[PDB]
Design a protein around this ligand. Structure first.
Ligand code: NA
Ligand code: NA
Ligand code: NA
Ligand code: NA
Lengths: 213, 208, 212, 208, 215, 205
């Protein structure tokens, strides 16, 4: 039924995805910070390949951060512009959540501690737990030095996801399994956006905003 | 009486008002020093004069260190210039009252996520119309957390319940995503105002 | 009939402006633009009672200026322009200063300087040609000591922009200067007028910042 | 005109007021949500009606993340209920004006200590009666700090000058212990008010 | 009979051109994109549009500057890489000459003083005069403060045109022409015209050889 | 797989080839890259008895490093790949340093640094199955702000600004530059994972 567009430029990965008639399509490229250069062309190519008009889009999902300061904000701008002009709602979704949901798609983890490298020798951190198909946040998200990091579980199997885990040796807990290369991917944003769209969580374009931690 | 209710203690930003009618505005976005005042103005006009307000209620915390303090400063300012009293209410209590209104929970163990791998903890039991603190509020690791009832049927409300697995006891049902809501603060303020609990603007302060 | 929307967030100023049926409206506020720019755009179209569908091109400040601020404008403009299928008009923020200084003080020769990161200034010199401040030479990012005008030693010229807080380290200085001017969308719009008239518009995808 | 001036951006807590007379109250203690409002009341009475105030000035920062925000919230509240405009002023500028009034410095490199081993940096030059920003304010490591004058005679004011040894240039004289003072904010507000720079209570916000 | 590919990325403009069987074809695009993105796609599009295979190219011309020494560097590398792989000669051509050839094509000017803005209060300077359809340098190019630039013809009696961004400095120059165009930029089509004259003289350098480009 | 690898990221100029599982390399320090790179490619090719048409993919140092030298190697690579119709492999110069310092000094973990005005290019790498993989993220920072993600080596031009790092290492080489053989190593890893891209998309950091 619902046609949803998903954009993420919060990290080194620039990706875009489209839900249309139950089918999901994605483009994903890693570049460094040429995002402004490549985000629209990608939307254009995806719509073109799918044969979907932009007017067909019911809502635009975006990675709201945390991640790169300028990166995140490029996504925000494009999305703001698109949704205001179309007069459609937007869905803000955490990049830590996107990480979590990807680790669930690719590695089958149901309990993920998402961590993203951050400026000034901290990392962004949020732990997620599968609930009815959706990785949902457990506790709160934060920017912490890797030393002060902690899980909300006890004996439980969990996964370390994201480039924050480059700091694993400096961190209290080590998980049974881990992936420190993993980036937010728009395909997974699209899944999360679906759950949010089902609960009707969409907002006006003016409120498409980045997070502060 | 006409009462005004503000809360910025969590991700949630919320304002509410009580002539005899009761209205609420609730927006989840982390910024609070930007959207608070507008929400006030939007509500006063879409319902009423500001100088008609007899008292102002607020979340005193616990919660976000800066968040609670923004609401306090606003309330401190509003009330001083108006020369009206204020109504200090706990955010754990608001959660309690919310879980009552929403799911009919008469016994609510409220837990809000705190810094440094801890939770703010408070247990509330429905007395007359109101959730009321059973014992005292604390800041604890999740493994040291405890309830004052026998385990009876009780509810877990708030973000602190992300740590449920690490706690020594779990309720039948719980909502890990509940946040303090200004409507519920307003209910709680009714009880406090009717009991003459108001204080002068200066004494409006966050909890420690 | 050409209707032009103009956005600028390159510096602490956030401004929008509209050109419709030979009329020019503009708002300007000095204060996180991501919160403010789009609401301003809304209020403005409302105040002029115009619809976004009417707009033929969107003009923007392409920098130089704040790295992230420029990018916020570029992102919104890209997004508006793509959904609307309209072309975009890139205009320099140094040019906008020059155009403002001409409007506000009659200066026909303006050395625009915007304070840049790491003890440098963005520098560009402009002179009036048929009512448009046009670039004379190149824009650059320079230490203030290495800054130079393309004109003969005082006709008079004017120093415009926050780069002029460095006037004492510069090898020369004008008779008059305003180190407090910021880009203003009304001037962006005047400039846009000229660029639209020469068909300088480009696809939404190409709305990008400059690097100096 | 009658103007009110608050600042809680540093350790210092300070309030000041301008009928034609000018009075100041200044106390150094780290708490601000407690002593601010009283200082307001003490000053209004030992001099004047609150509803007589035409505008309110405040330190917008930089400084203490929570500190600045407490003053903002107070000012946001006061001004809204009074329905008067507000006057945003930088704390680095206040330092500049203070070092002028106190030691006669016409060129002041203001530096306030910041988190994460950095300093807030702003250079000010006396123009007409007022210190005015030369270039822009920044948050820098002390080794990257730079002045916009030739080295002429200039002054270093504020806590950021604890890091002087790590900076690439040092002035003839400096005061590492200066803090923003409400008197000086009030001077700076005069210039801003006379230029019609006031804004509506909501737009009162801290700097980033 | 000769097939030449031409590209220029020395300024804000990216342009590409092709001589094939006596016909010229060119695309010119002015954009803020970094060239690295757009130069190859433009080459691709032009070849496909003309129906010419890369392997049919006899030689490749490029503007060797002066100009933005980022876009010039891009050009030097692409062309050297394309030519190393094809094993075909390279034809370095001055951007000051390209301007002259352009002012001649567009404006009819047979004597052109090309000037391009340079770093640090200087301009790149070169004077050009028509010979047999080709604008030809007289006598060398320099990077000079604007007060020292000079023309080799009589500044007043002769008819000459000023071309390029350096003419921003015209007030500081010891002479000026009746007409100038300080916005004029290099165009690959005029690079092509000049490449043909150079090719016809047996110019052309293997990619391996030291390139007559001094940056 | 026949792989060709090029670096002019810094002052050093180097090229390498992997043909028939043999790895060959030419290294030369010369402050002149738009002049010596292609000769080096041709010489190395002769010495391997390989024709450029044999090559399946072309690796290059994408930076960071000297802005001129990087932009030329990028351009050369794009040109080669467009004409041969071959994919390209972008590899960080900081990773290349880290791979060199492993091969040469045995270092199982490296903190690569390259001088940029004031700031220096920073990246920390760890060995994982013979490949020096990035730990956190690469960054441009002033020398003082530099952090580490952890018996660890310090590599590159940027370790000349050692004082107030704040951390000093076990051992270090402040004159270590990127080397094509180590770019080659890293490329083989990238190749094997299907990381190749179009010539069009070869771009610097
Ligand atoms: Na980090
Ligand atoms: Na500067
Ligand atoms: Na060009
Ligand atoms: Na010049």
């Amino acid at each position: 039924m619902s046609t949803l567009l998903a954009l993420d430029t919060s990290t080194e990965a620039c990706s875009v995805a489209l839900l249309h008639e139950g089918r999901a399509l994605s483009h994903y490229e890693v570049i460094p910070r040429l995002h402004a250069q490549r985000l629209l062309p990608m939307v254009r190519d995806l719509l073109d390949e799918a044969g979907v008009a932009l007017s067909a889009v019911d809502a635009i999902a975006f990675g709201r951060g945390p991640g790169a300061f300028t990166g995140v904000r490029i996504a925000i701008g494009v999305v703001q512009g698109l949704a205001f002009a179309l007069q459609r709602p937007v869905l803000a979704v955490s990049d830590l959540a996107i990480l979590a949901q990807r680790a669930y798609r690719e590695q089958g983890a149901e309990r993920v501690a998402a961590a993203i490298d951050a400026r000034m020798d901290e990392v962004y951190w949020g732990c997620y737990q599968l609930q009815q198909g959706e990785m949902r946040l457990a506790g709160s998200e934060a920017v912490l030095p890797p030393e002060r990091v902690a899980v909300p579980w006890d004996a439980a199997d969990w996964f370390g996801a994201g480039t924050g885990w480059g700091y694993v040796e400096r961190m209290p807990q080590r998980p049974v399994a881990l992936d420190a290369s993993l980036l937010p991917h728009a395909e997974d944003l699209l899944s999360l956006a679906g759950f949010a769209w089902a609960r009707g969580e969409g907002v006006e374009a003016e409120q498409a905003l980045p997070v502060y931690l």
